[PDB]
Amino acid sequence: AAQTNAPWGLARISSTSPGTSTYYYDESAGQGSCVYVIDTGIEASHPEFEGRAQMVKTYYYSSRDGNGHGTHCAGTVGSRTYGVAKKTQLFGVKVLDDNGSGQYSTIIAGMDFVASDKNNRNCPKGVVASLSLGGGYSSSVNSAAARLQSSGVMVAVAAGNNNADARNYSPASEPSVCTVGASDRYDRRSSFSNYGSVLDIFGPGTSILSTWIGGSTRSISGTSMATPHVAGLAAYLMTLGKTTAASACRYIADTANKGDLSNIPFGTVNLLAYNNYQA
Numbered sequence: 254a255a256q257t258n259a260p261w262g263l264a265r266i267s268s269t270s271p272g273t274s275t276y277y278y279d280e281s282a283g284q285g286s287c288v289y290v291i292d293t294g295i296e297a298s299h300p301e302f303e304g305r306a307q308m309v310k311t312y313y314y315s316s317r318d319g320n321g322h323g324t325h326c327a328g329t330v331g332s333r334t335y336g337v338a339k340k341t342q343l344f345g346v347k348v349l350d351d352n353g354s355g356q357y358s359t360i361i362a363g364m365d366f367v368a369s370d371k372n373n374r375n376c377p378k379g380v381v382a383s384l385s386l387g388g389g390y391s392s393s394v395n396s397a398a399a400r401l402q403s404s405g406v407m408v409a410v411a412a413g414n415n416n417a418d419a420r421n422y423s424p425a426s427e428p429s430v431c432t433v434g435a436s437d438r439y440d441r442r443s444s445f446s447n448y449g450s451v452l453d454i455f456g457p458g459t460s461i462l463s464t465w466i467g468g469s470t471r472s473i474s475g476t477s478m479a480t481p482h483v484a485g486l487a488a489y490l491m492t493l494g495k496t497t498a499a500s501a502c503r504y505i506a507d508t509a510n511k512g513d514l515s516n517i518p519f520g521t522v523n524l525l526a527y528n529n530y531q532a
Contacts, residue, residue: 322477
């Protein structure tokens with residue numbers, strides 16, 4: 254399938270080269286796969302989700318995404334226009350309040366929730382979790398991410414927006430999960446993207462256009478927005494049977510675009526998420 258004039262992020266993950274505007278993907282598009290967006294929640298009623306998005310858990314008075322960042326990330330994973338896996342099922346775990354903040358214990362509860370809820374969901378092609386959140390290092394948050402990955406969900410996490418080594422940020426520093434740095438449309442490391450040996454892949458992270466609350470759209474930047482690209486790519490990859498949740502992040506690293514990114518620190522992988530789709 255070919256989506257013309259797609260967001261540069263989508264076109265980039267289906268491209269050996271930057272500067273293109275058409276997203277190419279197998280029409281299965283993550284059908285039968287699931288992506289938990291652990292964030293501020295999802296505007297499930299947004300027309301871009303086509304009834305494929307749904308809140309499954311909130312730890313606050315409402316499951317409504319009063320922030321938009323979780324709706325944005327869910328849009329990058331599997332919205333119809335803005336999404337990697339345009340047919341995946343999106344599940345909202347609102348662990349972040351509408352200010353975008355969440356206690357680690359709530360974030361840990363949401364991760365253990367997904368590890369169990371996936372057994373309440375129909376994901377024959379595989380389960381993915383996209384955590385566009387992060388704070389200082391927490392060996393408990395890392396273990397919660399390790400558990401979620403251990404349970405049979407891919408864990409895609411943001412490297413963080415600190416222009417630092419992600420070793421000091423959780424769940425970015427958890428080695429078993431998939432830590433995603435951010436890149437811009439010129440294949441530069443997104444200036445804000447965290448780096449380091451713990452990073453597993455880079456995704457489109459700068460000026461990412463996707464869904465927003467109020468049925469709208471907007472373009473915002475972050476490793477928190479490269480992460481849904483990789484989470485959507487994972488669900489896309491599990492649906493084609495090219496990988497499993499336990500082996501998706503490495504797979505994406507194995508099939509990535511190598512050495513194409515600029516300003517990658519010495520010691521950080523120079524890998525860009527690439528769907529390897531050949532029309």
